[model samples]
Target: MNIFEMLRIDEGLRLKIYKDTEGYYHIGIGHLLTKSPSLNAAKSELDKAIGRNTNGVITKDEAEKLFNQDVDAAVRGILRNAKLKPVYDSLDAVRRAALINMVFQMGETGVAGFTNSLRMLQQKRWDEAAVNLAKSRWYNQTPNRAKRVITTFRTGTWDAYKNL
Candidate 1:
């Protein structure tokens, strides 16, 4: 399956301003508006990318472009990290997407911090890796996303992203 498509669904798309659980504003596919230090600047950037004054609404095509850009950033950033690059290369497509999704949500540094879990995943110890991931605050903060990600790591399937 396409990783970008998978993450778009997992993250859920938004054409307009929306609040994450932390109350930070985001748009498109999980792109943080607060990243610009001010909402106005972020909105301006988004408007430029969409090539018009959207008044906060983005077209589906523009949103998809943003999502792909974000996913590309996540993928490239994760691979740039020496520790993750090797392990990331060793996994199959399904398992690779699990790692990509983790970094996509938390950033590569966050995923890299899970040393033991990464090692477990590297060894293909699915259950142990899942257990370790369950102990993170990331899990508690967004249980639904965590559950699906953890389950994907454990099962090596896209099933967790399906049927809901």
Candidate 2:
């Protein structure tokens, strides 16, 4: 009936590692997760915490906790990656957040595949790096998300997130 009411109801629906009617890994009124392996990480982590490989539906609150844990691992992985750490270190705060943001969506393995962009980044060619990032298949496939990263890369400003 009201906006708040809609959000309240909406919060009851969404997605992740599991596919829905449209095959998108998502839930919670329609939250599309871009992370690799999409939906299973949360439950998988719970499995680890309990010392087992398991699968089952989890509470929304539990799912959220896993999501948070997943990103924390994501950020830590990117920050500690030998190759990426160097590139990550070279970037400013905005640039760091920018790369971390991409890592969260694409996963570390996927992010590592940005050969040309990393090459340009290591070479200190910020312009070329930005251009190359936009030119990569990642960009071609994810035009909208690329815009946020591109903005951060070029201007050292995290427009998509205020904390980073």
Candidate 3:
């Protein structure tokens, strides 16, 4: 699977409305429903996308489209961050996917805050970068996912992606 497909599995497909870790209403594989302004606004947009009033539900195909868009946005966002752009270019595809996965979860600004880790990554110091990534509040909040991402960075392989 490519980065997009891998992320779909990692994020998981949820057709119904549910609260994410931060208590925001989300649907269809982490699609944020809490607003361009409000939850209702996002709901209306989703309804429009599915070509009907889904009533807080979305189909698999619809979800996949949104996932693709999100992944695209994540890629662009990461590439646009001046600090991360060079670091992103300095990695192989496997490691690049790992970084994109992180940008998908946290925004570019969020990932860019990891100065030490990014520096390590830019230097191709996988082990140190992984360790620094693990030493964060993000890791504390989601250790399981963090471990997988960290290991992916450290090993520069898809081994950690056995299952998400």
TM-score of each: 0.90, 0.63, 0.90
How many clashing pairs per prediction, in order? 0, 13, 0
- Ten residues in a row with the worst lDDT in model 2? 1-10
Q: Candidate 1 on 13-96: residue-level lDDT in tens?
A: 889977778777788888766754567877787677667888888888888888878888998997799989988998888989
lDDT tens readout by residue for model 2, 33-124: 43346456555544554344545344566556555565567679987787788888787665776776677556688889897888787676
State the weakest 10-residue window (summed lDDT) of model 1.
32-41
Runs of candidate 2 with Cα error greater than 4 angstroms are 1-60, 160-164
Identify the candidate with maximal lDDT. Answer: 1
Which of 2 and 3 is the better model by TM-score? 3
Off by over 4 Å in 3: 35-42, 48-51
Best of the two (1, 2) by lDDT: 1
What lDDT would each prediction earn against the true structure?
Answer: 0.85, 0.60, 0.83
